[PDB]
Amino acid sequence: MYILFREMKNNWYSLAALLSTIYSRHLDVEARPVKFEEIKKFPPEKTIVAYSFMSFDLDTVREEVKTLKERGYTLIAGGPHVTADPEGCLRMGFDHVFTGDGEENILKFLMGERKKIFDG
Amino acid sequence: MYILFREMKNNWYSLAALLSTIYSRHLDVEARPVKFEEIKKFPPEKTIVAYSFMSFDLDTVREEVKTLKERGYTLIAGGPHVTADPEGCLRMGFDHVFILKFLM
Ligand SMILES: [Pt+2]
């Protein structure tokens, strides 16, 4: 009772750090949370979608990815699953994947680093 | 330019069946999706924290479980890694593992 809470991981990046760095480094980037029905309010040419999921969700992720790729977005992903078999996620349609901690690696990506796999 | 984050938000929470209640039913019980670096401001005596995690990041869970328990927070848990060896998650400092029956 009395104010229940939630914690999830979704730890593969640090949001606060990400927003902080985008702010401090004067990058041109807009980070927003999104439900799949949300977009395309955003042009795929200018838009990157980042994914985090468990070993589950793999069937609907595989579906959402193929759709979003058909609509010509850029897809990156991280989290507990992506850490193990990042190659599958790459063969799943993701453009760039991030194993382990991707807090620093994601910033390198936004700054132009094109690696298919960012180690963590 | 635009980076959009898609969270899957899988739940052991039995949909809104168990959830939509704490909103609807509970005047004295409160629910909301949240994250860390928060939960600090909330009173430890009253607050419940429901963790969801994999075998990965099990060090961060333990580390946060050490801080929150020392501060007095009551922590619950559920998930794939909580399912397998809940006794381990219990020794980790979680008060109960997996819902509406408990909150009463
Ligand atoms: Pt999880």
PDB file of C-alpha atoms and ligand atoms in Angstrom:
ATOM      1  CA  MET A   1       0.000   0.000   0.000  1.00  0.00           C
ATOM      2  CA  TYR A   2       0.880   3.708  -0.014  1.00  0.00           C
ATOM      3  CA  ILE A   3       2.657   4.645  -3.288  1.00  0.00           C
ATOM      4  CA  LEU A   4       3.784   1.546  -5.216  1.00  0.00           C
ATOM      5  CA  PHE A   5       6.664   1.861  -7.721  1.00  0.00           C
ATOM      6  CA  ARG A   6       8.353   0.284 -10.757  1.00  0.00           C
ATOM      7  CA  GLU A   7      11.945  -0.279 -11.922  1.00  0.00           C
ATOM      8  CA  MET A   8      12.944  -1.765 -15.284  1.00  0.00           C
ATOM      9  CA  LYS A   9      16.046  -2.467 -17.391  1.00  0.00           C
ATOM     10  CA  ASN A  10      16.063  -0.834 -20.004  1.00  0.00           C
ATOM     11  CA  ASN A  11      19.404  -0.135 -18.297  1.00  0.00           C
ATOM     12  CA  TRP A  12      21.518  -0.370 -21.449  1.00  0.00           C
ATOM     13  CA  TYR A  13      21.593   3.406 -21.756  1.00  0.00           C
ATOM     14  CA  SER A  14      21.444   6.200 -19.215  1.00  0.00           C
ATOM     15  CA  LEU A  15      18.606   8.589 -20.034  1.00  0.00           C
ATOM     16  CA  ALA A  16      19.678  11.386 -17.697  1.00  0.00           C
ATOM     17  CA  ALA A  17      23.238  11.160 -19.007  1.00  0.00           C
ATOM     18  CA  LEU A  18      22.018  11.000 -22.600  1.00  0.00           C
ATOM     19  CA  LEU A  19      19.839  14.106 -22.314  1.00  0.00           C
ATOM     20  CA  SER A  20      22.598  15.844 -20.351  1.00  0.00           C
ATOM     21  CA  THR A  21      25.195  15.147 -23.015  1.00  0.00           C
ATOM     22  CA  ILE A  22      22.935  16.160 -25.913  1.00  0.00           C
ATOM     23  CA  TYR A  23      22.345  19.383 -24.000  1.00  0.00           C
ATOM     24  CA  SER A  24      25.970  20.048 -23.065  1.00  0.00           C
ATOM     25  CA  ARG A  25      27.534  19.008 -26.389  1.00  0.00           C
ATOM     26  CA  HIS A  26      25.084  21.190 -28.348  1.00  0.00           C
ATOM     27  CA  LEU A  27      24.134  18.198 -30.501  1.00  0.00           C
ATOM     28  CA  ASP A  28      21.057  18.528 -32.668  1.00  0.00           C
ATOM     29  CA  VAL A  29      18.908  15.704 -31.354  1.00  0.00           C
ATOM     30  CA  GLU A  30      15.455  15.214 -29.863  1.00  0.00           C
ATOM     31  CA  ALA A  31      14.970  12.275 -27.515  1.00  0.00           C
ATOM     32  CA  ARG A  32      11.361  11.332 -26.884  1.00  0.00           C
ATOM     33  CA  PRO A  33       9.582   8.233 -25.540  1.00  0.00           C
ATOM     34  CA  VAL A  34       7.350   6.575 -28.127  1.00  0.00           C
ATOM     35  CA  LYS A  35       4.521   4.073 -28.454  1.00  0.00           C
ATOM     36  CA  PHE A  36       4.509   2.275 -31.821  1.00  0.00           C
ATOM     37  CA  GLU A  37       1.262   4.021 -32.820  1.00  0.00           C
ATOM     38  CA  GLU A  38       3.259   7.171 -32.215  1.00  0.00           C
ATOM     39  CA  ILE A  39       5.442   8.036 -35.118  1.00  0.00           C
ATOM     40  CA  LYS A  40       5.252   8.439 -38.001  1.00  0.00           C
ATOM     41  CA  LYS A  41       4.803  11.953 -36.766  1.00  0.00           C
ATOM     42  CA  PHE A  42       8.493  11.993 -37.497  1.00  0.00           C
ATOM     43  CA  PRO A  43      10.139  11.698 -40.911  1.00  0.00           C
ATOM     44  CA  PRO A  44      12.127   8.439 -41.220  1.00  0.00           C
ATOM     45  CA  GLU A  45      14.866  10.369 -43.056  1.00  0.00           C
ATOM     46  CA  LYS A  46      15.546  12.319 -39.853  1.00  0.00           C
ATOM     47  CA  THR A  47      14.447   9.654 -37.364  1.00  0.00           C
ATOM     48  CA  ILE A  48      16.180   6.912 -35.372  1.00  0.00           C
ATOM     49  CA  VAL A  49      14.217   4.396 -33.299  1.00  0.00           C
ATOM     50  CA  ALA A  50      15.931   2.728 -30.334  1.00  0.00           C
ATOM     51  CA  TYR A  51      14.651  -0.555 -28.919  1.00  0.00           C
ATOM     52  CA  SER A  52      14.931  -2.298 -25.565  1.00  0.00           C
ATOM     53  CA  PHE A  53      13.236  -5.625 -24.863  1.00  0.00           C
ATOM     54  CA  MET A  54      13.645  -8.912 -22.998  1.00  0.00           C
ATOM     55  CA  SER A  55      14.309 -12.310 -24.580  1.00  0.00           C
ATOM     56  CA  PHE A  56      10.524 -12.148 -24.943  1.00  0.00           C
ATOM     57  CA  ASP A  57       8.861  -9.534 -27.204  1.00  0.00           C
ATOM     58  CA  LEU A  58      11.120 -10.996 -29.893  1.00  0.00           C
ATOM     59  CA  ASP A  59       8.193 -11.928 -32.134  1.00  0.00           C
ATOM     60  CA  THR A  60       6.564  -8.484 -32.153  1.00  0.00           C
ATOM     61  CA  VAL A  61       9.922  -6.689 -32.272  1.00  0.00           C
ATOM     62  CA  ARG A  62      10.823  -8.741 -35.345  1.00  0.00           C
ATOM     63  CA  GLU A  63       7.512  -7.545 -36.765  1.00  0.00           C
ATOM     64  CA  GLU A  64       7.801  -3.870 -35.807  1.00  0.00           C
ATOM     65  CA  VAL A  65      11.366  -3.757 -37.126  1.00  0.00           C
ATOM     66  CA  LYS A  66      10.534  -5.089 -40.584  1.00  0.00           C
ATOM     67  CA  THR A  67       7.660  -2.620 -40.838  1.00  0.00           C
ATOM     68  CA  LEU A  68       9.768   0.339 -39.721  1.00  0.00           C
ATOM     69  CA  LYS A  69      12.561  -0.684 -42.095  1.00  0.00           C
ATOM     70  CA  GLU A  70      10.000  -0.825 -44.917  1.00  0.00           C
ATOM     71  CA  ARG A  71       9.108   2.739 -43.994  1.00  0.00           C
ATOM     72  CA  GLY A  72      12.809   3.547 -44.101  1.00  0.00           C
ATOM     73  CA  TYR A  73      13.746   4.356 -40.516  1.00  0.00           C
ATOM     74  CA  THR A  74      17.024   3.842 -38.717  1.00  0.00           C
ATOM     75  CA  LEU A  75      16.894   1.175 -36.033  1.00  0.00           C
ATOM     76  CA  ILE A  76      19.181   0.698 -33.046  1.00  0.00           C
ATOM     77  CA  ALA A  77      18.657  -1.572 -30.055  1.00  0.00           C
ATOM     78  CA  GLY A  78      20.110  -2.607 -26.710  1.00  0.00           C
ATOM     79  CA  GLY A  79      19.278  -4.364 -23.466  1.00  0.00           C
ATOM     80  CA  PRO A  80      19.511  -7.856 -21.926  1.00  0.00           C
ATOM     81  CA  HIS A  81      18.767  -9.770 -25.120  1.00  0.00           C
ATOM     82  CA  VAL A  82      20.823  -7.668 -27.554  1.00  0.00           C
ATOM     83  CA  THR A  83      23.821  -8.277 -25.286  1.00  0.00           C
ATOM     84  CA  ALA A  84      23.523 -11.988 -26.092  1.00  0.00           C
ATOM     85  CA  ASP A  85      23.482 -12.670 -29.838  1.00  0.00           C
ATOM     86  CA  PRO A  86      23.829  -9.104 -31.148  1.00  0.00           C
ATOM     87  CA  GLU A  87      24.254 -10.734 -34.568  1.00  0.00           C
ATOM     88  CA  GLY A  88      20.687 -12.021 -34.565  1.00  0.00           C
ATOM     89  CA  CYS A  89      19.401  -8.525 -33.863  1.00  0.00           C
ATOM     90  CA  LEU A  90      21.550  -7.353 -36.770  1.00  0.00           C
ATOM     91  CA  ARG A  91      20.052 -10.085 -38.959  1.00  0.00           C
ATOM     92  CA  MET A  92      16.686  -9.064 -37.501  1.00  0.00           C
ATOM     93  CA  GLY A  93      16.810  -5.757 -39.368  1.00  0.00           C
ATOM     94  CA  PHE A  94      18.495  -3.484 -36.821  1.00  0.00           C
ATOM     95  CA  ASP A  95      21.086  -1.111 -38.277  1.00  0.00           C
ATOM     96  CA  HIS A  96      23.264  -0.770 -35.172  1.00  0.00           C
ATOM     97  CA  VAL A  97      23.157  -2.724 -31.911  1.00  0.00           C
ATOM     98  CA  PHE A  98      24.644  -1.966 -28.490  1.00  0.00           C
ATOM     99  CA  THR A  99      25.842  -4.707 -26.149  1.00  0.00           C
ATOM    100  CA  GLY A 100      26.383  -4.155 -22.429  1.00  0.00           C
ATOM    101  CA  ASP A 101      26.457  -0.557 -21.245  1.00  0.00           C
ATOM    102  CA  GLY A 102      25.734   1.685 -24.223  1.00  0.00           C
ATOM    103  CA  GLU A 103      25.716   5.028 -22.403  1.00  0.00           C
ATOM    104  CA  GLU A 104      28.945   6.248 -24.006  1.00  0.00           C
ATOM    105  CA  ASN A 105      28.616   4.224 -27.212  1.00  0.00           C
ATOM    106  CA  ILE A 106      25.242   5.707 -28.111  1.00  0.00           C
ATOM    107  CA  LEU A 107      26.750   9.188 -28.009  1.00  0.00           C
ATOM    108  CA  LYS A 108      29.467   8.104 -30.418  1.00  0.00           C
ATOM    109  CA  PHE A 109      26.678   6.860 -32.679  1.00  0.00           C
ATOM    110  CA  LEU A 110      24.798  10.168 -32.554  1.00  0.00           C
ATOM    111  CA  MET A 111      28.145  11.768 -33.360  1.00  0.00           C
ATOM    112  CA  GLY A 112      28.498   9.670 -36.496  1.00  0.00           C
ATOM    113  CA  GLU A 113      30.140   6.357 -35.585  1.00  0.00           C
ATOM    114  CA  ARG A 114      28.666   3.731 -37.896  1.00  0.00           C
ATOM    115  CA  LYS A 115      29.716   0.445 -36.198  1.00  0.00           C
ATOM    116  CA  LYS A 116      27.175  -2.375 -36.526  1.00  0.00           C
ATOM    117  CA  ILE A 117      28.098  -3.491 -32.998  1.00  0.00           C
ATOM    118  CA  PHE A 118      29.012  -1.216 -30.085  1.00  0.00           C
ATOM    119  CA  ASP A 119      30.676  -3.340 -27.396  1.00  0.00           C
ATOM    120  CA  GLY A 120      29.800  -3.003 -23.710  1.00  0.00           C
TER     121      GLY A 120
ATOM    122  CA  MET B   1      17.811  14.647 -35.298  1.00  0.00           C
ATOM    123  CA  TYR B   2      15.019  12.458 -33.901  1.00  0.00           C
ATOM    124  CA  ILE B   3      15.766   9.579 -31.538  1.00  0.00           C
ATOM    125  CA  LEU B   4      12.656   7.782 -30.298  1.00  0.00           C
ATOM    126  CA  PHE B   5      12.824   5.200 -27.516  1.00  0.00           C
ATOM    127  CA  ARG B   6      10.523   2.192 -27.674  1.00  0.00           C
ATOM    128  CA  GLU B   7      10.044   0.497 -24.308  1.00  0.00           C
ATOM    129  CA  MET B   8       8.312  -2.890 -24.384  1.00  0.00           C
ATOM    130  CA  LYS B   9       7.148  -2.692 -20.763  1.00  0.00           C
ATOM    131  CA  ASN B  10       6.331  -6.390 -20.392  1.00  0.00           C
ATOM    132  CA  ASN B  11       4.539  -7.115 -17.134  1.00  0.00           C
ATOM    133  CA  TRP B  12       3.860  -9.880 -14.622  1.00  0.00           C
ATOM    134  CA  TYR B  13       1.288  -7.480 -13.226  1.00  0.00           C
ATOM    135  CA  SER B  14      -1.772  -9.189 -14.775  1.00  0.00           C
ATOM    136  CA  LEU B  15      -2.636  -6.323 -17.126  1.00  0.00           C
ATOM    137  CA  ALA B  16      -4.870  -3.530 -15.920  1.00  0.00           C
ATOM    138  CA  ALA B  17      -6.931  -6.157 -14.119  1.00  0.00           C
ATOM    139  CA  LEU B  18      -4.597  -5.907 -11.148  1.00  0.00           C
ATOM    140  CA  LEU B  19      -3.318  -2.457 -12.200  1.00  0.00           C
ATOM    141  CA  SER B  20      -6.329  -0.326 -13.151  1.00  0.00           C
ATOM    142  CA  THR B  21      -7.571  -0.980  -9.701  1.00  0.00           C
ATOM    143  CA  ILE B  22      -4.875   0.833  -7.686  1.00  0.00           C
ATOM    144  CA  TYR B  23      -5.896   3.798  -9.783  1.00  0.00           C
ATOM    145  CA  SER B  24      -9.631   3.217  -9.558  1.00  0.00           C
ATOM    146  CA  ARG B  25     -10.003   1.351  -6.250  1.00  0.00           C
ATOM    147  CA  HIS B  26      -7.246   2.520  -4.034  1.00  0.00           C
ATOM    148  CA  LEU B  27      -7.556   5.930  -2.461  1.00  0.00           C
ATOM    149  CA  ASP B  28      -4.735   5.147  -0.064  1.00  0.00           C
ATOM    150  CA  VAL B  29      -2.659   3.111  -2.552  1.00  0.00           C
ATOM    151  CA  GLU B  30      -0.857   4.694  -5.522  1.00  0.00           C
ATOM    152  CA  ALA B  31       0.654   3.425  -8.792  1.00  0.00           C
ATOM    153  CA  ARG B  32       2.746   4.856 -11.645  1.00  0.00           C
ATOM    154  CA  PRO B  33       5.440   3.821 -14.158  1.00  0.00           C
ATOM    155  CA  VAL B  34       8.807   5.143 -12.922  1.00  0.00           C
ATOM    156  CA  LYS B  35      12.594   4.814 -12.759  1.00  0.00           C
ATOM    157  CA  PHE B  36      15.624   5.229 -10.491  1.00  0.00           C
ATOM    158  CA  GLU B  37      17.295   8.455  -9.278  1.00  0.00           C
ATOM    159  CA  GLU B  38      13.699   9.050  -8.319  1.00  0.00           C
ATOM    160  CA  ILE B  39      12.102   6.927  -5.561  1.00  0.00           C
ATOM    161  CA  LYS B  40      14.653   8.622  -3.309  1.00  0.00           C
ATOM    162  CA  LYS B  41      12.364  11.557  -2.588  1.00  0.00           C
ATOM    163  CA  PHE B  42       9.436   9.286  -1.733  1.00  0.00           C
ATOM    164  CA  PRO B  43       8.938   8.271   1.932  1.00  0.00           C
ATOM    165  CA  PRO B  44      10.555   4.874   2.698  1.00  0.00           C
ATOM    166  CA  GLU B  45       7.960   3.980   5.331  1.00  0.00           C
ATOM    167  CA  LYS B  46       4.983   4.128   2.974  1.00  0.00           C
ATOM    168  CA  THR B  47       6.537   3.342  -0.421  1.00  0.00           C
ATOM    169  CA  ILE B  48       6.453  -0.015  -2.231  1.00  0.00           C
ATOM    170  CA  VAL B  49       8.881  -0.672  -5.097  1.00  0.00           C
ATOM    171  CA  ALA B  50       8.206  -3.409  -7.661  1.00  0.00           C
ATOM    172  CA  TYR B  51      11.337  -4.489  -9.526  1.00  0.00           C
ATOM    173  CA  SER B  52      11.452  -6.156 -12.944  1.00  0.00           C
ATOM    174  CA  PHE B  53      14.788  -7.456 -14.238  1.00  0.00           C
ATOM    175  CA  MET B  54      16.726 -10.146 -16.114  1.00  0.00           C
ATOM    176  CA  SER B  55      19.827 -12.117 -15.112  1.00  0.00           C
ATOM    177  CA  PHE B  56      21.760  -9.231 -16.658  1.00  0.00           C
ATOM    178  CA  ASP B  57      22.143  -6.036 -14.607  1.00  0.00           C
ATOM    179  CA  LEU B  58      21.767  -8.265 -11.548  1.00  0.00           C
ATOM    180  CA  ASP B  59      24.588  -6.303  -9.932  1.00  0.00           C
ATOM    181  CA  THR B  60      22.757  -2.981 -10.246  1.00  0.00           C
ATOM    182  CA  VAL B  61      19.593  -4.546  -8.840  1.00  0.00           C
ATOM    183  CA  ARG B  62      21.533  -5.866  -5.853  1.00  0.00           C
ATOM    184  CA  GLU B  63      23.269  -2.504  -5.410  1.00  0.00           C
ATOM    185  CA  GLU B  64      19.991  -0.578  -5.486  1.00  0.00           C
ATOM    186  CA  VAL B  65      18.392  -3.232  -3.284  1.00  0.00           C
ATOM    187  CA  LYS B  66      21.145  -2.600  -0.740  1.00  0.00           C
ATOM    188  CA  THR B  67      20.521   1.151  -0.665  1.00  0.00           C
ATOM    189  CA  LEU B  68      16.723   1.039  -0.582  1.00  0.00           C
ATOM    190  CA  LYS B  69      16.582  -1.649   2.121  1.00  0.00           C
ATOM    191  CA  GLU B  70      19.048   0.316   4.246  1.00  0.00           C
ATOM    192  CA  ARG B  71      16.796   3.345   3.803  1.00  0.00           C
ATOM    193  CA  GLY B  72      13.697   1.356   4.742  1.00  0.00           C
ATOM    194  CA  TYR B  73      11.883   0.898   1.423  1.00  0.00           C
ATOM    195  CA  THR B  74       9.746  -2.192   0.911  1.00  0.00           C
ATOM    196  CA  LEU B  75      10.685  -3.992  -2.288  1.00  0.00           C
ATOM    197  CA  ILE B  76       8.797  -6.598  -4.304  1.00  0.00           C
ATOM    198  CA  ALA B  77       9.834  -8.311  -7.537  1.00  0.00           C
ATOM    199  CA  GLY B  78       8.677 -10.304 -10.540  1.00  0.00           C
ATOM    200  CA  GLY B  79       9.980 -11.506 -13.881  1.00  0.00           C
ATOM    201  CA  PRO B  80      11.818 -14.321 -15.684  1.00  0.00           C
ATOM    202  CA  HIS B  81      14.834 -14.237 -13.346  1.00  0.00           C
ATOM    203  CA  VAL B  82      12.522 -13.851 -10.361  1.00  0.00           C
ATOM    204  CA  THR B  83      10.589 -16.922 -11.490  1.00  0.00           C
ATOM    205  CA  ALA B  84      13.721 -19.076 -11.608  1.00  0.00           C
ATOM    206  CA  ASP B  85      15.211 -19.204  -8.106  1.00  0.00           C
ATOM    207  CA  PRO B  86      12.943 -16.774  -6.226  1.00  0.00           C
ATOM    208  CA  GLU B  87      14.753 -17.890  -3.066  1.00  0.00           C
ATOM    209  CA  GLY B  88      17.834 -16.193  -4.481  1.00  0.00           C
ATOM    210  CA  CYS B  89      15.899 -12.993  -5.133  1.00  0.00           C
ATOM    211  CA  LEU B  90      14.636 -13.231  -1.547  1.00  0.00           C
ATOM    212  CA  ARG B  91      18.137 -13.457  -0.074  1.00  0.00           C
ATOM    213  CA  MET B  92      18.974 -10.473  -2.269  1.00  0.00           C
ATOM    214  CA  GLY B  93      16.802  -8.395   0.066  1.00  0.00           C
ATOM    215  CA  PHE B  94      13.402  -8.491  -1.658  1.00  0.00           C
ATOM    216  CA  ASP B  95      10.540  -8.733   0.847  1.00  0.00           C
ATOM    217  CA  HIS B  96       8.226 -10.727  -1.396  1.00  0.00           C
ATOM    218  CA  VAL B  97       8.384 -12.137  -4.914  1.00  0.00           C
ATOM    219  CA  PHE B  98       5.677 -12.948  -7.456  1.00  0.00           C
ATOM    220  CA  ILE B  99      -0.607  -9.037  -6.552  1.00  0.00           C
ATOM    221  CA  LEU B 100      -3.686  -7.118  -5.414  1.00  0.00           C
ATOM    222  CA  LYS B 101      -3.996  -9.484  -2.449  1.00  0.00           C
ATOM    223  CA  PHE B 102      -0.554  -8.424  -1.209  1.00  0.00           C
ATOM    224  CA  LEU B 103      -1.137  -4.661  -1.352  1.00  0.00           C
ATOM    225  CA  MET B 104      -4.063  -5.028   1.040  1.00  0.00           C
TER     226      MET B 104
HETATM  227 PT    PT C   1      13.196  -7.639 -17.642  1.00  0.00          PT
END
